[PDB]
Amino acid sequence: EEIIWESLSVDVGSQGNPGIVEYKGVDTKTGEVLFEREPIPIGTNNMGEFLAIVHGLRYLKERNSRKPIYSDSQTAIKWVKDKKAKSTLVRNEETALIWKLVDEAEEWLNTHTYETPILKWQTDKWGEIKADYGR
RNA sequence: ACAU
DNA sequence: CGATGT
Ligand SMILES: [K+]
Ligand SMILES: [K+]
Ligand SMILES: [Mg+2]
Ligand SMILES: [Mg+2]
């Protein structure tokens, strides 16, 4: 119903899918960019969306912040809930890096705790998520 | 179908 | 138009 403005919004950007993947997190209220991942040469949209949320979790925990995270990805929200990214992406030499990051993100979730609410950004009502890349 |  | 996902 109401946007929770005191929150962190994340999103993925890619050139191709699968393709070059990056992600960022912003202050929902102001749009300030709080983190940005160096582009990863081959990944999927959903792996990027998943890593973005987990990074948000790590970022907010490190800073003792109880803010919620918004993501527009139904898929990534569920993967985080499950602590398991069910990506179809082939594992080979050119996807090794993204798969290393995904594996490590799952491992972080399985070894840490958090109370952060992970909320669905309601694109149909509110427009584009504030972390969107605009591609 | 929905979410990207 | 193509792909990633539940
Ligand atoms: K975009
Ligand atoms: K589809
Ligand atoms: Mg998105
Ligand atoms: Mg976007």
Side-chain angles (χ1 to χ4, degrees):
Chain A
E1 182 62 286
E2 266 255 309
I3 291 161
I4 299 169
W5 288 105
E6 196 175 302
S7 61
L8 172 69
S9 294
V10 300
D11 194 19
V12 67
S14 81
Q15 305 163 230
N17 183 30
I20 301 177
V21 169
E22 62 190 335
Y23 67 74
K24 71 169 174 279
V26 310
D27 186 312
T28 307
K29 185 152 55 200
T30 70
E32 179 177 355
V33 178
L34 301 178
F35 59 81
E36 281 181 286
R37 168 63 215 202
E38 171 175 308
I40 299 148
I42 299 292
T44 72
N45 67 327
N46 293 322
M47 306 170 86
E49 299 268 24
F50 171 77
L51 292 177
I53 299 171
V54 180
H55 197 82
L57 290 167
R58 296 181 72 167
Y59 178 93
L60 292 165
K61 186 173 178 79
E62 176 64 23
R63 289 157 181 78
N64 290 319
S65 170
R66 290 172 53 78
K67 286 179 191 187
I69 293 166
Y70 277 115
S71 172
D72 67 23
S73 175
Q74 191 178 110
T75 294
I77 295 174
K78 180 193 190 297
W79 285 1
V80 173
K81 175 181 186 172
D82 296 342
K83 304 187 178 193
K84 195 64 203 179
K86 222 176 79 188
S87 176
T88 71
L89 187 64
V90 65
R91 284 189 189 253
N92 64 22
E93 200 149 270
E94 55 175 346
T95 69
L97 178 53
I98 189 87
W99 265 118
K100 188 162 178 295
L101 294 174
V102 168
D103 291 341
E104 293 168 345
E106 297 181 339
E107 185 65 23
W108 188 89
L109 294 172
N110 281 328
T111 50
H112 300 73
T113 60
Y114 66 84
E115 287 174 32
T116 307
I118 302 170
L119 308 178
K120 179 65 176 61
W121 180 264
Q122 292 181 58
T123 305
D124 57 329
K125 299 176 195 61
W126 305 338
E128 281 279 27
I129 190 155
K130 304 309 181 167
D132 183 53
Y133 281 83
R135 338 195 131 164

